[PDB]
Structures are given as C-alpha cells and as structure tokens.
Enzyme design. Structure first.
Site, mmCIF file in Angstrom:
data_model
loop_
_atom_site.group_PDB
_atom_site.id
_atom_site.type_symbol
_atom_site.label_atom_id
_atom_site.label_comp_id
_atom_site.label_asym_id
_atom_site.label_seq_id
_atom_site.Cartn_x
_atom_site.Cartn_y
_atom_site.Cartn_z
ATOM 1 N N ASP A 138 0.864 -1.176 0.000
ATOM 2 C CA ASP A 138 0.000 0.000 0.000
ATOM 3 C C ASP A 138 0.896 1.219 0.000
ATOM 4 O O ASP A 138 2.070 1.108 -0.370
ATOM 5 C CB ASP A 138 -0.961 -0.014 1.204
ATOM 6 C CG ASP A 138 -1.874 -1.266 1.223
ATOM 7 O OD1 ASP A 138 -1.741 -2.114 0.303
ATOM 8 O OD2 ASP A 138 -2.685 -1.427 2.180
ATOM 9 N N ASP B 278 -5.898 4.169 -8.227
ATOM 10 C CA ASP B 278 -6.639 3.157 -8.975
ATOM 11 C C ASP B 278 -6.484 1.791 -8.335
ATOM 12 O O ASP B 278 -7.470 1.106 -8.048
ATOM 13 C CB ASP B 278 -6.134 3.103 -10.422
ATOM 14 C CG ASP B 278 -6.900 4.029 -11.345
ATOM 15 O OD1 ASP B 278 -8.148 3.929 -11.397
ATOM 16 O OD2 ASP B 278 -6.248 4.862 -12.022
ATOM 17 N N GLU C 69 -10.989 -2.836 -13.395
ATOM 18 C CA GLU C 69 -9.561 -3.120 -13.277
ATOM 19 C C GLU C 69 -9.140 -4.491 -13.791
ATOM 20 O O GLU C 69 -7.951 -4.690 -14.047
ATOM 21 C CB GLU C 69 -9.113 -2.996 -11.817
ATOM 22 C CG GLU C 69 -8.710 -1.585 -11.422
ATOM 23 C CD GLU C 69 -7.463 -1.110 -12.154
ATOM 24 O OE1 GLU C 69 -6.440 -1.835 -12.129
ATOM 25 O OE2 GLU C 69 -7.509 -0.011 -12.757
ATOM 26 N N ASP D 285 -16.919 0.157 -10.390
ATOM 27 C CA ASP D 285 -15.790 0.950 -10.818
ATOM 28 C C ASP D 285 -15.154 1.528 -9.561
ATOM 29 O O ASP D 285 -15.745 2.421 -8.935
ATOM 30 C CB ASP D 285 -16.254 2.058 -11.759
ATOM 31 C CG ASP D 285 -15.113 2.784 -12.407
ATOM 32 O OD1 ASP D 285 -13.951 2.519 -12.040
ATOM 33 O OD2 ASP D 285 -15.379 3.645 -13.271
ATOM 34 N N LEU E 149 -12.587 3.492 -8.816
ATOM 35 C CA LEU E 149 -12.189 4.903 -8.809
ATOM 36 C C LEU E 149 -12.402 5.465 -10.222
ATOM 37 O O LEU E 149 -11.493 5.482 -11.056
ATOM 38 C CB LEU E 149 -10.752 5.081 -8.329
ATOM 39 C CG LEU E 149 -10.478 6.464 -7.703
ATOM 40 C CD1 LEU E 149 -11.432 6.783 -6.546
ATOM 41 C CD2 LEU E 149 -9.031 6.608 -7.253
ATOM 42 N N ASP E 150 -13.621 5.935 -10.466
ATOM 43 C CA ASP E 150 -13.952 6.619 -11.706
ATOM 44 C C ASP E 150 -13.396 8.041 -11.691
ATOM 45 O O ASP E 150 -13.600 8.791 -10.729
ATOM 46 C CB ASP E 150 -15.470 6.622 -11.903
ATOM 47 C CG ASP E 150 -15.952 7.760 -12.804
ATOM 48 O OD1 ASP E 150 -16.451 8.788 -12.265
ATOM 49 O OD2 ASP E 150 -15.802 7.631 -14.047
ATOM 50 N N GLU F 77 -20.788 1.304 -14.733
ATOM 51 C CA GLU F 77 -20.964 2.747 -14.830
ATOM 52 C C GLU F 77 -22.401 3.079 -15.207
ATOM 53 O O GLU F 77 -23.117 3.705 -14.413
ATOM 54 C CB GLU F 77 -19.966 3.361 -15.835
ATOM 55 C CG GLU F 77 -18.500 2.988 -15.560
ATOM 56 C CD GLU F 77 -17.476 3.741 -16.412
ATOM 57 O OE1 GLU F 77 -17.648 3.855 -17.644
ATOM 58 O OE2 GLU F 77 -16.470 4.204 -15.837
HETATM 59 MG MG MG Z 1 -14.547 4.825 -14.918
#
Ligand code: MG
Ligand code: YR9
Ligand code: YR9
Ligand code: YR9
Ligand code: YR9
Ligand code: MG
Ligand code: MG
Lengths: 325, 319, 321, 319
Positions: free
Chosen positions: A58, A64, A88, A108, A110-111, A270
C-alpha cells in the site's frame, strides 16, 4: 433523530426480514469507501515525500490500484458475494468458496482517471445483483440487465464525501463525517427535479456527434420557444456530473460517436448503476433506443451510450432522436 | 528532501532579508485554509444533525480568513467578495500588506459537492497615509504574492510569488502543506478548452470563432477536449496542471465579464504569468487593468501561452 | 482476514439468530465512542480559542449527551444509568427496546487537565422485570450482564468488548473511523508482576491490603518485587492489567468504608471483562458480579486481575477475617 | 486574540532580533510531533491488518525527529535515546543548534496504550570545532529551549524558554498547536507524589522516610495521593499542572538513577525551573551536572518547590 448508514440499513433490513447478507455487504462497502476517501484526500502523503527519510514506503500503490484492492478485499471478506466485476480486471473474480455469498457486485473502484492529478472529484460506482443461476458461480452470473439490480449507488469524493444509495424503494444520500468515520443520513427519498437548466457532455467531440445530438445541443443554446438557454457544466468525472444532475436537475450525455459508436462508458459498473439511481429518483436513463436497465449484456466490459437526468429533458432528447430516424 | 509551506517560506524569507511580515501573513492564511478545508470536508457534520441532541460555509470561511489575517499583524486593508467595503485593520494589529480574497469560490456548487476553493492576492501598501479602500485599487502587476487553495479530491495550496509558482498538498493526517511540485511551469500548448458554452447565444464573434477552431482544428490536429467544472479554482487548476485554456469572456449580456478583478482574476492571472502562461482581457494583460472599484468585473482568458496567443489572434481579427 | 467490530458483531449475531437489538445498540455505542474520542483529542478546539473570531460544553456533559442520545435512538434500550445523572433515565415509550445500559461516559475527568487516559465504561443488561421501566431495572447483579466493556482514549483509542463467549479488543483507526479487530478472545496472564493501587491511603487500609502490598514489595519467597503502576484512571489501570497481567485494587478504606469506585458502571463491567478473560474480581467477601445492587450510584470495593494474584490476595484476606 | 505555536514563536523572535534559526528548528520539530501523534493514534492501522488484502513506533518516531531536524538547517549534532552515538548532520545542512531528545518516551509500554511522549532539549553549539558528540556534553543550564509533547487523551506540546513555559494543544482537525496556557507556573506545594514503589526494598533510607511522611504526615495533616504512570512525560506533565513531586532517585541497581540526563532529566528540569519548580539529583541541581557521556544517567526529584525542598531536608538528614 440522527441516523447513520449502518443503523439505517440495519433497521430497514429488520423491517424486510431479510437474511442480513445485503446489510453486511453494504457495511463492508462503506468501510472500503472510507479507506478510499482517506487515500483520495492524501492522508499520509507526507511520508511519500520523505518526512521520515524515505525508509517508509500500500502507500506506494497508485489510487486506482489501492481503491480496487480495498473494494475487492472488503467485498470478498463480507461473506456476501460470489462474483465480482471491476473496471480493473479482464475476467470476473470468483470468490473463494469458503467466503461465498449470494450477491454479485459490479463496480468501478475509482472513476475519474484523467482527473486525479488535477484533483477534480472522483468516485466509486457500484451495482448489486443477486445470483440467479443455479450453476457454479462464473462470469455469466454478472450478465444481467440493470432491471435485476437489488441496490446500486456511488460514493462521490468531492469537496465532501457522499454515498448515494438507491434501492427499489428510493434513493438516500449519506454524508461522510470524517471526524468520526460515519455516514450521516442527510437526504431521504430523493427525487430528481422534473426539468432542469443544465446540459452536460463533452462538446469537444462536436465533429463526431450524431445529428440528433447536434440538434439537441442546439436547442439548449438557442431555444426555439425563445426560452432561456440552459447552462453548461462538464466535470469529466461521471460520478460528479451525475450527482450534480441528481441534485440540481438537468441532462447528462455520453452518446455514441466515432471513437466509440457504442458510447464510452461501461454498462455493468458505470451506466447501469447511474440508470438505477436515476430511475429510482424519478429520472430517466436511455441509450436512445431503449432504457439502459433493459439492455441485456453479453460482455461484462461492453460499452453503451447513455443519456440521463430530469425526465422532461430526456424525453425532449428522445423526441429529437426519433425525428432523426 | 521534504519541505513544508511554512518551512519553505521561512527560509526563502530569511534569504531575502525581509521583515518576516509576509511569512506571518501566509502562515496565518495557511491556518485559515486548513480550517476551511476541515469544514468543507464536513468534519463534525454529525453534531449539526443531532448526534448529541450555525453559519453556512461561506460566512464561516470569510470569518476564518478575516480573523486569521487581522491577528497576523501583517495587514492593513482586507477586501473580500463577502463584504461591500474594505475592512480596515484596527491600528494595533496593523501590518503593511493589502489582501484581496474570495474566501470560498463556488456557490451554485456547495450543495452538489464539487470543487470549491479560496483565492487570494497580496499587495504591498505603497502610500504613507492612513489605510483606506483606495489601497486595494492597484494593478495586478504590483502583486507581491497570490494563489489559491483548492478543496478538491484533496486540498492543494498553489502559491505564486515573483520567483515562481509552487504547489503544496495538504496532508490531513498531520495538517501540513507538503511541497509536491516546485517551480511549476504550465505546458506551452494544451489540449483542453474550458468555458460555459451555454452562453453561445451571446458570445462575441471572436469567442464563437475561437471555440470553433477548438472543435474543428484548421491544421487537422485532434479537437481539444472540453471541461468546465463551473468553479473557477477547479477549472484554473486543471488548466495549470494539464495545460489548455480557460475562458470567462465578456458576453454581450455583461460586457465587463462576470469574474471579479481583484480577488478572482488578478490572483489567477498572477499564477498563470509566473508559471509561463498568460491571462488577458482581450484588450490587455489582466494584470495591467487599473481598477476603480474593489468589486469590479473583468473578462478573463488564461492558460497555456500558445493557446492564449491563438485566441488573441482571433480577437484582433474581429476589429 | 481484516475484521471490523461492525462486521464482527453483525456476523456473530446472525449465527446466534438473535433479533439484532444488541447489535443495533452496540453500533450506536461505537458511534458515540468515535465522537467522544474526536472531542477528547480536541478536534476543533481552535474554534473555542477564537480561530473564526471572538468567542461550549464540558467534555463530561457532551460525552454523556453522546451516549444518551445514541442509545435512546438505537430503539434498543429502555433504562439508561449514567455516572453523570442523579437518576436513571427512562427512555421514551416510542423508542423503547429490551436493554438496560449502565455507563460512565467519560471516566476520569479528574484527569482531563493533566491529559492522561480517559475512558467510557458500559454494562449491558437484558431488562428482567416486566414492570413499567424504572430504576429497579438497573439493579441487577453483574452476573446478569449480556455484554460489557470499555473504550480507552489513551495513546490510541481501543474498545474492549466482553460477551459470554469472551473478550475482544478493537483498535480505532481514526483515518477511517472504523474499529479494527486486533485481539481475538484475549485471556489474562495466570500471574502478573504489577500491582496497581493508590498507596496514598496506606494510613486507612485494612490489615489485609496492608499485608498483601508488603508481600509485593518484600516477597517472603525472596523472588523479585512486583512493579507498581497507578494512572488513577480506572480504564487505563484495568486495561494494563488485562494486557500485561497482575492485580488492580481499589479497596475500601476507613474514610470510604463501602469503597470508592461505583458498582453499576465501573466495577461490574470491569469484573465482567476480567472474568470473561480468565481473571478474577472480588470484594474480598464475594465476587463483584454477585453483589446485588440496591442503589444505582452505590460504591463497591474491588480487587481484580490475574487469577493467581487475586487468589493470593484472598489468601491474605482470609487470614485476617 | 487566537495564537498558534508557529505565529507566537515567530512574533517573539522578531522582538528578540534573532537569526530565525531557532524558530525554524521548532517549526520542524512541531511537524515531526504531529507526525508522531498521527502514528501513535494508529491512523492507517487498518492497512496493516489487511483492509486492502512493521517498523517499531519509536523507530519511526526517531526517524521523523531525525529527518525533520536534519532538514531544518538549524542543527549540527543530534543525540537520541534511540541511537548509540551522536548523529552528525551533513556539512551542507549544518545549523548552529544541538538537539538532545527522546523520540518516544514511555514507549516500551505502548502496548498498554498508556501515554507516550517526546522529550527534547535544544542547545547552542559552543565551539567552532568540527561537530562531534562533545557538543552535546553541556550542562542543562546552557539550554536555549526544552520541553515535550504529551501523546495522551489529547496531544500537548510544552515549550520552556528563558522567558517561561507555554502549553500548546494540538488541534488535529487542522494540525495547529494552539496556545492554551501562557507563562505557566507550578503551584508552590502539591498533594501528589509519584514514583515506582516496587523498588521499596532497594530505596535509599531518605526515600523510605520521605514517602512514609507522605502516607503518614507527622503534623497529622492529610496524606498525599499517589500516582505513577511509568511514562516520564505523563508523570511530569501532571506534576506541572497539579503540583507535587516526581521521583526517580538513586539506590542500589542505580547509584546514578535510571533516567538519562541529556534527553530525560535536563529538559524536564529546565521546564520545572522555568515554571518556578525545582529539580535535584539529591546532591546537585539537575541542570548543573556537567555530563561526560551522552547516555549517562542522573537521579531526579522534581516538582513543586516546597515539596522538593522537603525531600532535600529528609535527604540531608541521611547524608
Ligand atoms: Mg470509470
Ligand atoms: C429500500 C429499502 O429500504 N429496502 C430494504 C432495505 C434492506 C432490505 C433487506 C436487507 S438484508 O436482507 O440484507 N438484512 C436484514 O434483513 N437484516 C436484519 C436486521 C435486523 C434484524 C434482523 Br432479524 C435482520 C437490508 C436492507
Ligand atoms: C460473544 C458472542 O459471540 N456473542 C454472540 C454475539 C451476538 C451479537 C448480536 C446478537 S443480536 O441479538 O443483536 N442478533 C442479531 O444481530 N441478528 C441478526 C440477524 C440477521 C441479520 C443481522 Br445484520 C443480525 C446476538 C449475538
Ligand atoms: C521566551 C520568548 O518569549 N521567545 C523566544 C525568543 C526567541 C524565539 C526565536 C528566536 S530566533 O533565533 O529563531 N530569531 C527569530 O525568530 N528572528 C526573527 C523572526 C521574525 C522576524 C524577524 Br525581523 C526576526 C529568538 C528568540
Ligand atoms: C519567491 C521567493 O523565493 N522568496 C520570496 C518569498 C519571501 C517570503 C517571505 C519574505 S519576508 O518579508 O516575510 N522575510 C522574512 O520573513 N525574513 C525572516 C527574518 C527573520 C526571521 C524569519 Br523566521 C524570517 C520575503 C520573501
Ligand atoms: Mg466568488
Ligand atoms: Mg467515573
């Protein structure tokens, strides 16, 4: 009476006399959302920059990746899930049998990719289905239309962090209190305004717009009935633009063009959740040919055009779109 | 080696052999910004909602900046978007700097939770007479320092001085601004254009034409991407970081523009110019406009140097 | 894998097929504890000292208000007894549940100025009588506890939660506001090397306490003397006894002949955590959990900690009776 | 009028016409303390426990104080409880101060979550010789500044200089130390005594008798209360705010005590004397011992003057 996410969903599930699996799922998702939010606000960044002499690195993962690891591990360990799909990973993840639960989650983590280095709002999008096939869990169990959603929502990491949670009874907004790591219910049974005064899309693609979209944008800039022109806003992070659409009314568009004749945004994690939130808040979400929630997918990463927001604004687009057939 | 805003400004101040006053001002400003950030992220919102059984953010933010600057003993005149007249610092707390600020830019915006920010500009008081509102009426070229806090996905402080532009990220775990980008220079040419295209009805012909070139480029390069957050600090910071151009031009329905010269335009123009960008009204460099009203508006086109020059070239055509 | 108190308790309640009221109560308490922690760490104190211009509530009062309001709104409780309140609080009929809760919301406000550890102690009973809810519902012996524990606001914020199955320790990660399981099913050492009590009452001690302390400083069996530690805040002293072992004493003395600490919301919860972790807790006459309370603020002697250490004390106590 | 440590220390330095180096050292030190505070409160601990699918705390604390002091440009020799030898700042970073510190005191008891603390003493380098560990062998009288951070229920910084003692409370929401007690003075006589009575079999006859007078006052007055946390910072801070006496004296296993002169006894003796208290070894005032070893030990009895004096009377009675 004050109410927190965890308490509120606990009580609602008691009422429904469900098994407590969805509630565990949501609680685990909330923990992941709090960890992602802490990371997005750059907690600990001073260690990345050598405050201790660069022995402590980490932490070094990009947001992302960290975001995806957090949602994955938290959902895996909720004992509530069996098939997970993320922007991902190419293939759906099949949960370890000892951890298997009944729900299927598309998300998703982290859009807002072209948008972290400029520090604009980013978000987490999720949609939750129940496993309907009797088969071994597999990628197929995630290929359900948006209409099968039991719950969807998003976390917006903006000037504040908010979690929007839609189920079939409606849409609730929970503001995260970072001083205590609790999501405070701030707006029950939200409904989108019937007609708004904002249109939202990337107009740099103007050279590639369908003529139906070209005309609709024209109608907002030069209204035929001499009404006032709409205002324009486009953040470019879909979680922020849709939330603004939800809270102020109006229309958001990522329609089909040249670089993507099937739209750019992904259907499972999404488009479907934003459609589910919008419909349950009294809005609309169409590809132009149908409701987004009715598209039966064949690929977990397939794209779709999406036009959503205040119902009067989407109907107006739909009229302009029929007129161009 | 790691540096913090306060350490960095302290050594750069000691090197220049100044009185420490500007360092005092900025440290007081930093404290206000961290307290604004804490309120914007909604720390303690649970108490507002009865967890244990009153100001909105923009009033609170104005009070934080007003008080932190008064008690810095470094200021004499403070202009805010929130106040109709200049605040004159009472005599015992008086320093020699004039500060014009927007405590929390973003108003059609708090309730939908997208980026907001604090903008600020620091002028040195020239005259030897009793401080007055007149002392804030200086061109941007006289700025000693200027910048902004952006309460975005994270909180960043951008600080421009004569030397250049530096970017400091707030680490909320320890409440320090950490220096993350030194001597920032904007891209010579960008690929994003940023303006409210809902005003297309009222655009001057030059804007209409310049926009068209972004959508249908006359050298068959790819069209620019469009981005418009509606919060000047967010739009301007993306412009600084990725390049491109930001426009709030004079439409025919307010021929002076919308953004305020002293505490929105001048600071953003100063940041642009000190990072190798530009900021124009169309008729002159924003920093050269001489103000007659502390709340007057200016039209603004800023960003990458090649992008601003290109808009200006279109602008000269239309005359 | 990682576990949080919210997930852990929820998953345990599901297996146990309970109704979820206890889980709900525990979620409310955890939320109040995070909010006490934030106030105790002084988040926002800049505003008290005028950061926004010329300018609320003692930590005691606010902490009680937080526990009071979160327990009331959990819909899981009917009677609430607090160190802060002269009388037991009876929950409004429309928010009444099955549980009776006795708590000290901020144990150690005589230690707030010197900034040492403060804490929240709590014991949870099933309401036992069918009468209209009243103070009598809080008078059950600690044997009847269904759950008890404390939150320690020390160098970090820990929550210790005892139920009939055992004791678990959760660390608050303040970056995310989540109580993280760090110690599952803790058990106290059989024998410790620390003794903890205010020796300033030496003039007023019983000969039993007097002899037991002497054995710690000058062990007749010529082994090493015990170390001494005494923060003077019960949550800190009891917590060290849990994690490091040994014995904690607040006996009666001539000036406080019924003891100093309070039975309902200090001794009983600590006795319950101690017994569920394999230790002991006695008045000398009986197990603390077996005292039948008659008054909600009544006091009790207590001697608790590692079983071998408490048994030794009791051997000294019996010689003197 | 509100005040933060950085602003307050800075304004005081303007008034004393110093180079600004000490201000910079202290600001560097404050930033390290906020970073130690965040780590002590276990911010981020969920990630160590697998939330996303192990340096000792006091080693990370030492690294933070080491690195922030090195990069302050105010220091040249650093003596830490964590390090065998004095650390020599690299030539290009050398400043004029020597800092002796315990980065995380009481930290062998972090497991019980008892208070921990940071102790520090700041010296002016006395010779022009190449910096070496000999520059830390000054008597505590030579201290320019000393104090501690208490990581307890809240995080407090106590800062003693020649002018006196000020207490700063960290507001973790904004990462500022707020001035909450100005020019602190310990009360003349207290009612608490603090020491490990587990050592009773090995006590000096004077310590045996003095403590017996606390439990059984021969004038039949009220006995003192006893407190002993086992973390020097917490015990000394309580002595400061409530008065009384703290003891870690010599005996058998320790003709010179257990606590260490340079980074435990001296800073706390300096804080005590600036607050109007006392601090003795028994034979001499702590601040007058000339050290010969950077890790050498000294006995210490400190606190309210009436109480220390009474101990010295019992001590002389047995000499
Ligand atoms: Mg996205
Ligand atoms: C829109 C809406 O309110 N839907 C109901 C929300 C809901 C429904 C079902 C669940 S569950 O199946 O995951 N959890 C559940 O039933 N928990 C529970 C809680 C308290 C007592 C018991 Br016996 C069971 C969650 C949310
Ligand atoms: C130490 C131990 O394991 N004790 C048993 C733990 C425990 C916790 C909570 C309960 S309950 O009474 O509150 N029941 C409960 O929460 N049930 C439940 C059912 C379905 C869904 C949910 Br989310 C919760 C009992 C025992
Ligand atoms: C005891 C007390 O009241 N104050 C501490 C006195 C003090 C503090 C700091 C320094 S210095 O050596 O770091 N010099 C300094 O701060 N100089 C300074 C600061 C700001 C403006 C100017 Br023109 C100079 C000295 C004494
Ligand atoms: C652009 C650049 O790279 N640099 C200019 C930045 C700067 C900042 C502050 C000041 S200043 O006017 O405020 N000067 C001092 O503050 N000097 C000082 C003196 C004694 C003690 C302390 Br501590 C500080 C001048 C210039
Ligand atoms: Mg404004
Ligand atoms: Mg108490």
């Amino acid at each position: 009476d004050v109410n927190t996410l965890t308490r509120f969903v606990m009580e609602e599930g008691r009422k429904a006399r469900g098994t407590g699996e969805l509630t565990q799922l949501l609680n685990s998702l909330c923990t992941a959302v709090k960890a992602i939010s802490s990371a997005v606000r750059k907690a600990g960044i001073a260690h990345l920059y050598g405050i201790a002499g660069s022995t402590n690195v980490d932490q070094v993962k990009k947001l992302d990746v960290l975001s995806n690891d957090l949602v994955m591990n938290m959902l895996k360990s909720s004992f509530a899930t069996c098939v997970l799909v993320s922007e991902e990973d190419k293939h759906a993840i099949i949960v370890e049998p000892e951890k298997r639960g009944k729900y299927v989650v598309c998300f998703d983590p982290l859009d807002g990719s072209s948008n972290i280095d400029c520090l604009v709002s980013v978000g987490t999008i999720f949609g939750i289905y129940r496993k309907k096939s009797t088969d071994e869990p597999s990628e197929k169990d995630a290929l359900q239309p948006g209409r099968n959603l039991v719950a969807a929502g998003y976390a917006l990491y903006g000037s504040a962090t908010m979690l929007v949670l839609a189920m079939d009874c409606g849409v609730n907004c929970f503001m995260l209190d970072p001083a205590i790591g609790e999501f405070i219910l701030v707006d029950k049974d939200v409904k989108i305004k019937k007609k708004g005064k904002i249109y939202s899309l990337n107009e740099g693609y103007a050279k590639d717009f369908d003529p139906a979209v070209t005309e609709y944008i024209q109608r907002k800039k030069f209204p035929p009935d001499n009404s006032a022109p709409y205002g324009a806003r486009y953040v470019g992070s879909m979680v922020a633009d849709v939330h603004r659409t939800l809270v102020y009314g109006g229309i958001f568009l990522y329609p089909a063009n040249k670089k993507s004749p099937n739209g750019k945004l992904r259907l499972l994690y999404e488009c479907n959740p934003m459609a589910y939130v919008m419909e349950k808040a009294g809005g609309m979400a169409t590809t132009g040919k149908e409701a987004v929630l009715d598209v039966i997918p064949t690929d977990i990463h397939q794209r779709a055009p999406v036009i959503l927001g205040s119902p009067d604004d989407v109907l107006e687009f739909l009229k302009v779109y029929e007129k161009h057939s």
